[PDB]
Amino acid sequence: SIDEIYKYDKKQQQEILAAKPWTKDHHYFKYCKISALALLKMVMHARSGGNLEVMGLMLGKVDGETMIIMDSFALPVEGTETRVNAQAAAYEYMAAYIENAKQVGRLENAIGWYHSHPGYGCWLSGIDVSTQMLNQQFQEPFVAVVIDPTRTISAGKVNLGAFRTYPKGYKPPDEGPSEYQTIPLNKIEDFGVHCKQYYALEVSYFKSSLDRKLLELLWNKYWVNTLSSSSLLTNADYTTGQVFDLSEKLEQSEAQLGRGSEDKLAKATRDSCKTTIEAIHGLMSQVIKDKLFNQINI
Amino acid sequence: TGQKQYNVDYKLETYLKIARLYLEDDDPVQAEAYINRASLLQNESTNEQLQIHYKVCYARVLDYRRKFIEAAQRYNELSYKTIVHESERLEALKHALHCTILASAGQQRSRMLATLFKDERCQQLAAYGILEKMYLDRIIRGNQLQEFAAMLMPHQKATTADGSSILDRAVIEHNLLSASKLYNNITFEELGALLEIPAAKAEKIASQMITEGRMNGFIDQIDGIVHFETREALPTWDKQIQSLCFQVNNLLEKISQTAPEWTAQAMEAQMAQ
Amino acid sequence: KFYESKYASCLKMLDEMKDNLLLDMYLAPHVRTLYTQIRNRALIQYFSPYVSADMHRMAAAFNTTVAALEDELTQLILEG
Amino acid sequence: SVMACGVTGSVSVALHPLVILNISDHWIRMRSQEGRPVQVIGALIGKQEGRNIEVMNSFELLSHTVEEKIIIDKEYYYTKEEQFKQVFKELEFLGWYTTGGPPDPSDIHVHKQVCEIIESPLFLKLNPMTKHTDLPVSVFESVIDIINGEATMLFAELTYTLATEEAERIGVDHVARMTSTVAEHLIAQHSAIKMLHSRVKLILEYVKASEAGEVPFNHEILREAYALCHCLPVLSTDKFKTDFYDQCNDVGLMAYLGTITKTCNTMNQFVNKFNVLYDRQ
Amino acid sequence: TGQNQEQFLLLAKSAKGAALATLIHQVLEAPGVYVFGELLDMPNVRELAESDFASTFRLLTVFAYGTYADYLAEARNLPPLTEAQKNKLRHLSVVTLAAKVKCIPYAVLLEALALRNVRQLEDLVIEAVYADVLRGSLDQRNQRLEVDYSIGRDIQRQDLSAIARTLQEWCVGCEVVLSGIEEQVSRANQHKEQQLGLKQQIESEVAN
Amino acid sequence: LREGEFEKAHTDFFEAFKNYDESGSPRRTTCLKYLVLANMLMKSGINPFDSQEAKPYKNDPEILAMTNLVSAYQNNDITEFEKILKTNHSNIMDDPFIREHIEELLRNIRTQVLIKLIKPYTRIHIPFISKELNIDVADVESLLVQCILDNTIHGRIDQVNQLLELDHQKRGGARYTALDKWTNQLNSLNQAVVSKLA
């Protein structure tokens, strides 16, 4: 049953919240299921922030070792990424929004917070770790979602991560696959300092039976939008920002060869490769459009 | 303030009478103050006729106060009341239309122009031509404005600074914005000629609208040309591709609607390949 | 006069001071550098707000001849 | 079938798929709660630039039924408006949505209540129990007409297009797909081109059927096919050629610098190994 | 056109010689009616061809297929037209020019429509955009008309094949692009796997 | 005011006016005139009789000229400012402390009116500005020179054709600067990579 996940069982949630199985294991929560609606809303909000970090709250529930995100909403806050617990400034707003949401049938409560990292990957900074540690101390169960709208667009693939912090003093296990991401130099130090203070959940997505039907029928007209993308100029500032960072990365890799870490040039080469590959893909779509609509004549 | 507790309708009738009297005295500010007291009672009343009387008076106050969009909305709502005689529902619609044309440019005015344009009854009004042309962002001729100005009440012909009326200026600004949708760029001599105004006035008003942020563009004073928000280059190419493919979808839908037999017969050939 | 862009009167007063400042003990061995540095800066400050400037008005504003201004400017473009 | 059924009007509507998903989710959630299909109602927000309407987001609305009639809670809407204005400052109320078949008297009654909030609201209807092959989303404008001397409100259907937001397209594509760098990137284009090729082939076959005979001749459809033919090629101007080649040279130069970086790394690997095997450091 | 088609077809099936001859002068002097395909294909109007009202049928042929210059060349034979009909025919001539090329210079428009000054031409293009016949924008500086969209006028039963000749030219175009991707994608895999395989050989030599 | 510190003069004249309000006239009205002068010279206070003690004193017939002048300076109108200066001649020009800064204040209005005038243009005639601001052509060019040098006006002057070519031409220059630094670093890097072998 595709729509089974949409059923809200209040008593079952109260039973789980009274049981608190997460207190028995700091790696209790392993999976993160996100609704197509919440993904779209978070990506739409993240993109709307442009090159500035934005944040919001996520509404959902828990099911065994799985955290479920059903919906999300933007918070009118300043200082995302600079202020510890910046979300706190929207407390009043959050209380009213949720109250009003309950009036229209949004039964799911706060399950987490999402914020954007425009052009610098999905991970938790020092400020993010302090914020998530506060949330896990006072608002458990809670999860932190990070989205890179810029990389989503440039790669043509959703760039999202779901994370949970470890309590102060607690040491992680051997596990930590760590899927490689290019981290800019102005962020890499902070990344390295706090990278072992949290873990990444396994993310998956879902949609309803009606969403499935509607998206096939949407495609019957949405195909036009795939042949009129214009991705090269939409987020042009990202590639320029990455190149600006790449140049300083190459300056450091040159300094490594100068006199005397573990091969910075290869990392910088993989970064320049990724950025260029994305640019060429943009040109591929542009040339495809030129071949289809311009090279026809009378 | 008294010991007597007067009924809602007595208070409403008295406030309406006061408001009506202040309007007769050409004191719309005082009329509005008392019509505002009446507004707090009108919903508690069960006297339909009295509620219609305040609504008419309320709209008239707003009209005389130059709160044209608000007046237009109230007059328009009156035009839908089935208990009001058809002739009066039209007088109300005519008042709504005139107020909407005279209203300050913006989304509320444009939404009201849309509401009125969708109303078939507006075709019985002499100003329909103007409505249609305003709604459709068309250039309005001097002659058409002359006839419309003749359709107005004296208070509605208010004049700013140089003896020029709000309407005269609103029509020029509407025409400039409408011309901005036809051209990428135009000379002041030509723009003046198309708008039936001197070239210096076309430049001055265009310059004002650009500075005020009501029109996007830039002026070249040496070449004597105004350049309108082009939005050209590659995004235009993408939008033209969209128009072409949307034309494709509309054509397929029309083929399937008019002749579904051949649509299915040729549809099976796609699966056969 | 340097801040008010009145370079004619500025250089006039500066050249009026020149011979008198040339007699100073510690100031004299720098009188060539300072004056050249000032003049050059003035030339830059004069041309800073222009896209197209008349060389006759510039020569008249800097108390020099058009050809001498042309040579000075050529040197100013080559390095300055 | 009491509605307008005549001339087209007004606004050119651009719909964002987030709105469709919002409505679908609203209907799925209420159906899940009640264990039966429920008619859901909500607000449509976005941008209005003259006669161009862009429907960008939506939110659920509170309503009650008095006897048999649906009443929208206006106080709830104004509270919600004060909230959405804090995070979507550039957006405005454009109209409302509901679920079901073709428009009915209840929709007109509610539409009049929405008309008490905004002057010319749009009406969007989504059919979650569709029997047909086309997207079950319809948009309407309200027209006030005279039928048998009675001035009444009716709905007139508007044509609409889908939004062009890159991040939204990728999100929608990723959602719709739900499973080499080149192989997975040009698949969405390959399917889009295949869809276009199908439409082009169907129109071409209609043209040949009409010209050859047997199939009924139509002045109007073939006239539009002629008008479609004359739209190609799209953008043949010298300014577009300069811009297209500007784009191509920018990506080209960037690709050249990227290949230089990779060759710089390959040269570094080779020299690092050569200094060990063929040389003694 | 759409309403006017049914409104005048109802009169077309219930009209005779002279009434049809005057109806032609009524359909051509009516706003919104720019297509006459259904009216010209009528047997009632076919009877007027090579009859007492032949010039009116020739005028309808010019309005449905020809241009303003074709009317000027045969003005001595064709019936006289008012300013509104002359304008309409000019709008249709701009549509033919727009069907040929996207960017029309003012000189070609002034010559084809027989106009003297720029504003007259600009006002006619405005009248075209206003009557939903054309879509586009005018460029004063470069003295050029940029056409975004132009409607269909000519039916052309004999020349209909040309439409298919371009449609197939587009189809083949798609068929190339599609195959191109199919090949390129295949190559992108053909390289990848090969490289992986080669790497697996290099990595197998590390043990030696 | 003699030195140039207008904010400290404004605070000094405000507290002095408070003390003169506690004691009495005739220095109270003159101190209020110097307070309005400091409010205008500060660029811009524009709210003297909206503060505290100055609220009921705005109706005074002696200092009414300063209320008219501060409102004219608030809306940035040269014609009105010069009209009030011509109507209330003796009330303003007799005092040397206001007469000394009246030209600086006049130029401060002219600067803002010019800024409001240049915004919609890309190329603007100098004679046009001369006739619009009502100021000599040479003084227009001198004002534009000073204004561009202080970065208040974004543009340049074409002295030959007698026009102001305003800064508008802005495109994606951010990419080319990043590609420029990427090129420089790749040059130095490839030199350093080749330097490894011998």
Ligand SMILES: [Zn+2]
């Ligand atoms: Zn962060």
